[model samples]
Target: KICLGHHAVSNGTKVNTLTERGVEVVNATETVERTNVPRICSKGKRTVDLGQCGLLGTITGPPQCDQFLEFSADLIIERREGSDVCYPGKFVNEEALRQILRESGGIDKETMGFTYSGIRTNGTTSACRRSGSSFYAEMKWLLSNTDNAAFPQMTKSYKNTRKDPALIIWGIHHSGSTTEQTKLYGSGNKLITVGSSNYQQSFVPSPGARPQVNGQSGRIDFHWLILNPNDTVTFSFNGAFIAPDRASFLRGKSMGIQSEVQVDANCEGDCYHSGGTIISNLPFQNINSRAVGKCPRYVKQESLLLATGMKNVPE
Candidate 1:
């Protein structure tokens, strides 16, 4: 075991190695010389002080990818960006993603997150209003850590090294009829209501119902769109809008067209009921064709892990 004294030392399992042939002790008018002896004890069930043992535990090392896959002790500080609804405290239910996987036509309950195949139709859908030919929905999260000591290294790791580390604590996505997707990034928080119907939104919904042409039916088809690997796309705290200068990052290389849902006269009032969700002709695989080497070496998914129940850390 290890010993603590004027000069702390570890004799290890062989305590006899430390010998004191000329050690001395003194009292008022007398002095005595004796041999110093090391004691042997079981590296007991009790823990030795890190200082005494001079050993580093796993906790002392920098965080790695797998560590982010599971939630440890609550150590994240929540902070707001554009919206003030970030959650900082909660535990993710290990099984939250199962339901979403089932509804998406795929049956892999063990999958960690949603997997969309451009080659295969892996989209969800819901009921629609008049004039909406197709639909689009976007999910956004804010990752802003300004005052945390770990933030610098964490952010740096994302930039230079492990790019696609999964950081999301919890997420849920759905399109129409029975299509839905959900994820548990770390801890499940009540800050954002996952069960609310309001959570599933599209351009055809009430808040964005007007201008039907530019509404849910509107789609932007791009060609040769390029995404620079080093070009980071960051959103504000609330994620209501993109950072102004980064707007070009959202543009692609083509004059897109807006196609509306065509109606047949015989289909009168039941147009939407008989007309299944129209699948947009997206060359999903080719969507990123122009972004070959331009894409980040690894995608950082962890930064996107955010929820309203989590706390907003200090500035």
Candidate 2:
């Protein structure tokens, strides 16, 4: 079985010092049959589709302030080809996304089952109204600061994962207007600021580490639920269903799904790909708080359904 293994070196070779291995292959024209090449899938593309609301308008009432509105969704991930694996090796966590969505806001759907379609229902059931409430600059400020560090050798390094940079790969955050938070959330209660993690896995290289594990893909179910009026927005997204409460901030506006190789990320060859992700079923709700007696959780909800089928070629 002949493979394209290292060949005999020739005179015309030039050193590519900037490449990972720094040596270049020269004019070794040993033509193997094109049909003989075994095809393998390498890096992959990812898309994150979200459902949003035209929720911030001057509604009939002032957003029933005291009730809990649960923003929930199930993110479905699959392979663009018959291939499904982690590329650049990372899954965007729930907290960062919720904060980002709160920071930028999210939404969508067109029609019904051709390529792009609408919900499984007739109309918008999202009861999320618009208000100016949100995590203060102190919180969002930390967010704008939470991006993947550069990976070394592999192109970039977020301060090199070897030093074990303390990345808050888990949840929630904080602030100066201590009075404001105290006023809204009361004195003893503080906003959660976990710009750190306890687990060793929390320390990771910048994006696109080599395939660390396989069998990659599943439902990322997380939610932002307002528990006590303007007090705290509870987050539940892990085993044990542990609830980490952040000072309620998503009390305001609404914001895609686009993928770009981080700058200088060696998008040199097949990196600039054309693959699509599906937003199969995103059902958002405005569940009433427990005080309401019959929370009937998942009230005023609708599942935005958009896909040719459960699994087809994602655009």
Candidate 3:
């Protein structure tokens, strides 16, 4: 009998490395997640993330022949971009990503008084909207912590480097009546304040906030955006919007996006688990696009050991 660890991959796995690459991800597995990316678009230009396939065809005017393909957890496959064809991309899942950052060190005691479970609980984010062929959604978080701490904050950044969005928490104590807000580098890097009363938002939504939705007292923090979809477009903090501006900074070139909710203090409880904010139970009105829409839930249908659920196409 071959004794294999739970991390072993099956012979059918075609992903990065021999281990930890074959889990069927139908929804959020931990603290980090995004809209189910069904397809990844490629211009077939050069090799950055996807290797160029000559059989995939060529183009001359930004898609006189550009193609979209099935991007599974392994690599990019042959599938139509905007058509009925779709696939899932490689991921670290919620548990592993949580373990990495948690082990890496960011939050601490006295400064951030919330628990790790508090972060893992309320850090769920989403990108589900569109108009003028451009997409618009923001990193909206229902946060917790005492405002008087030097850097009581949360950050939504790319998954590769564990860098970028190194925002500033309140370095100095405010007036007792003013545990109001925090300040970052520029107008774009600031945190928005709202009471737990109105956890929803506006177009640059001007609402008060929420803390874990169980009727708790806390604030909401967010960064809004409307961007032209590219292979790997990035953004930093800004004054009012999340685009080219004097108030933001440049980020790396990875596509997987998620948020990090941290408090200054640390607790002994296990923060890595499956009890993240409920997303799929929310309305589907935010679901759109065939390229990167709802592919994670459908890609695992062919898995060798972990496959269950219907392969629903993007609507």
Candidate 4:
């Protein structure tokens, strides 16, 4: 149940960053329908793709209509623990990560995938480590801040639970590890200012000291929910579920978090925000969240389907 993963789509011309391109197109379409032309065609090239012209408008000339098809697909899989074990590593730090995996009873298929993708070492003097030298890749997943596929289906579920939908961000922070000292930012919420002083004590990783747990790491995982219709969001890291606490839960709402390396750092000075690279194979169903409290029955059905006529079912 991977709610979101990177996908590369090239409509045959050239490879473009689809995620960024999708966002731009979405924003423009929203703006156009509200305040501008409906169709913009040109005499330059009737069939012009963004891959070809590197821009969105007619290539040749007039009748420059703004006619376009702009629609978005969003999905949020609300999953609960269905596997026997789940590993929680030090918030994105390497040594801390190793500890969690050492003790984790994680599902192999879903938990076995990841890759080192990017790095960012910055000017911070403390808590710094070399970028891309940690032997681990940053991992990232994006959750849309808009409507999704399970909207109506979860409508009743929301009302029944009376919990406002929310996003939970989880990760680690450490010294000689300036990066993976992450941050969170998004639309509708005034982003939290990131700096040493701005770190929330309650939300900050535990044990109060740098590398507090040797061979173990301080982990930070928090829940953020939008409480009002205007989408005013509230976050909580130290509260219990369905219990009275700092943040209140609402009915009929859905929320999710996008995971990534928030920062990358090196001992000397360079530090950049990073969505820690994922270094293994991250399978879709494994990452997805579902309500099954036990191994799902769907696995048997799938296995049976694949082994119907075989001498012995393949493992």
Q: Which numbered prediction scores highest in lDDT against the true structure?
A: 3
Q: Among all windows of ten consecutive residues in candidate 2, which has the lowest summed lDDT?
A: 151-160
In terms of lDDT, the poorest run of 10 residues in model 3 is 83-92
Residue-wise C-alpha lDDT for candidate 4, range 147-257, written one tens digit per residue: 221111000011112232321122222222222222211112112211111223233322223453323333323222222222322223211111111222222221121
**Residue 57 lDDT in candidate 2:** 10
TM per prediction = 0.14, 0.18, 0.16, 0.18
Superposition-based RMSD of candidate 3 using all C-alpha atoms, in angstroms: 25.2
- Winner on TM-score between 2 and 4 is 4
Error of 3 at 182 (Å): 5.5
Task: Judge candidate 1 against the unseen true structure and give its global Cα lDDT, from 0 to 1.
Answer: 0.18
Q: After superposition, how far is residue 196 of candidate 1 from its true place, in Å?
A: 34
The list of candidate 1 runs beyond 4 A from truth reads 1-225, 237-315
CA lDDT, every model vs. true structure: 0.18, 0.21, 0.22, 0.20
lDDT of 1 by residue, 1-315 (tens): 997633222221111113532222221111111111121111211111111110111111111111211112111111111111111111123223222211222111112222221112212122121243212111122222221111111110111012221111222221112111001111111122111111221111111112323123212211111123333222111111111111111111111111122322222110011111122221221111122212222222212211212111222
TM-score of 4: 0.18
Please write out the lDDT profile of model 3 over residues 1-315, one tens digit for every residue.
878533322222222224555433322222122333222322331112222321111100012112312111211122123111011111113334323222222221111122232321222212111222211111122223332323323332221122333211111111111223332111122432321121222223222233322222222222222111221222222222222111111222222212122211222211111111113422221222222322223231222232333222232
Error at 40, model 4, angstroms: 48
